[PDB]
From a paper:
Toho-1 β-lactamase, also classified as CTX-M-44, is a class A ESBL. After substrate binding, Ser 70 attacks the carbonyl carbon of the β-lactam ring to form an acyl-enzyme intermediate, which is then deacylated to liberate the inactivated antibiotic. Glu 166 plays a vital role in the deacylation step (stages 3 to 5), where it acts as the activating base of a hydrolytic water molecule.
In the 15 K X-ray structure, the average atomic displacement parameter (ADP) or B factor for protein main chain atoms is 7.68 Å2, with an average of 12.92 Å2 for protein side chain atoms. However, at around 5 Å2, the values for the main-chain and side-chain ADPs of atoms in the three active site key residues, Lys 73, Ser 130, and Lys 234, are considerably lower than the average. Thus, we observed clear omit electron density for almost all of the deuterium atoms within the active site. The omit electron density for the side chain of Lys 234 confirms that it is in the ND3+ cationic form and reveals the positions of all three deuterium atoms. The omit electron density around the β-lactam ring nitrogen of aztreonam clearly indicates that it is protonated, with the deuterium orientated toward Oγ of Ser 130, with which it forms a hydrogen bond (2.84 Å). The omit electron density for Dγ of Ser 130 indicates that it is orientated toward Nζ of Lys 73, with which it forms a hydrogen bond (2.72 Å). The main chain carbonyl of Ser 237 hydrogen bonds to an amide group of the monobactam (2.77 Å), while one of the dual conformations of the side chain of Ser 237 interacts with a carboxylate group on the monobactam (2.70 Å).
Numbering used by the authors: 27 to 57, 59 to 238, 240 to 252, 254 to 290
């Protein structure tokens, strides 16, 4: 079966809706499956918030070391790093690292608040040429992932294009691009998602997201040992609010689309 037939069969077995966009930077070719359909980003949206702060830091050499006070009232549903710093401070760089590498939701919220609200994250995406991304809410409500709800959504293709621009392309000046890549490569939350579908020795940077409706997402930049990078978005969502998340589906999709590379 072709790659498209394999992805359709994966979706058919999955009990949900699968969205895939792979960009092969060797030749700019693409593998697309529901890639123009909206999906709730869940915590994959954190890449855009962190990158928006990195953009600001290009013109403010003190920004990344700016102190942010962490209070008990800032804690939400999932904040393994920020809870260690209640009554102290974290820098904006430390908040970017925590948001991306541990998916700390308090850290995401501090990034959003620093920027001036969810709409400012949307404006940053637009400044990169991404007409599709929208951030509407803070964490954790941005992960409700209700079917057909446009809030906090993008498409697989839009996010793959923007992730390519952010990590390998024109979106950020070099020091800031490099910092984003360092953060993504050090992610701790993605072992069982895209990474599990790839050769163990390939270098990967990624950001996961999991929400209601069993919504299970991962966005990655992948560096093969002997080939140009691949940028891969795998989004997955299910019809029932309390569906289990399915990182195995993302690993399976990654294996299908990276075969031969
Ligand atoms: C982002 O996707 C974010 N997700 C959530 O905060 C929600 N659940 O996350 C945890 C890890 C708690 C889970 O048990 O799935 C969630 C479900 S419903 C809702 N309104 N929020 C997490 C923290 N990011 S991820 O990268 O770890 O998935």
């Amino acid at each position: 079966n072709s790659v498209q037939q394999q992805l359709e069969a994966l979706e058919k077995s999955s009990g949900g809706r699968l969205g895939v966009a792979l960009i092969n930077t060797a030749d700019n070719s693409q593998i697309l499956y529901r890639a123009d359909e909206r999906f709730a980003m869940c915590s994959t949206s954190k890449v855009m918030a962190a990158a928006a702060v990195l953009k600001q830091s290009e013109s403010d050499k003190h920004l990344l070391n700016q102190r942010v006070e962490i209070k008990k009232s800032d804690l939400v549903n999932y904040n393994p790093i920020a809870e260690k710093h209640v009554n102290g401070t974290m820098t904006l760089a430390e908040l970017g690292a925590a948001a991306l590498q541990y998916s700390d939701n308090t850290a995401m919220n501090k990034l959003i608040a620093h920027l001036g609200g969810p709409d400012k994250v949307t404006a940053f995406a637009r400044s990169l040429g991404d007409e599709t991304f929208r951030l509407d809410r803070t964490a954790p409500t941005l992960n409700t992932a209700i079917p057909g709800d446009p809030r906090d959504t993008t498409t697989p293709l839009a996010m793959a294009q923007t992730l390519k621009n952010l990590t390998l392309g024109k979106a950020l000046a070099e020091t800031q691009r490099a910092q984003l890549v360092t953060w993504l490569k050090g992610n701790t939350t993605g072992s069982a998602s895209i990474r599990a579908g790839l050769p163990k020795s390939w270098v990967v940077g990624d950001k996961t997201g999991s929400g209601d409706y069993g919504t299970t997402n991962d966005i990655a930049v992948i560096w093969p040992e002997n080939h140009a990078p691949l940028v891969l978005v795998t989004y997955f969502t299910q019809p029932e609010q309390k569906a289990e998340n399915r990182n195995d589906i993302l690993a399976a999709a990654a294996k299908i689309v990276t075969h031969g590379f």
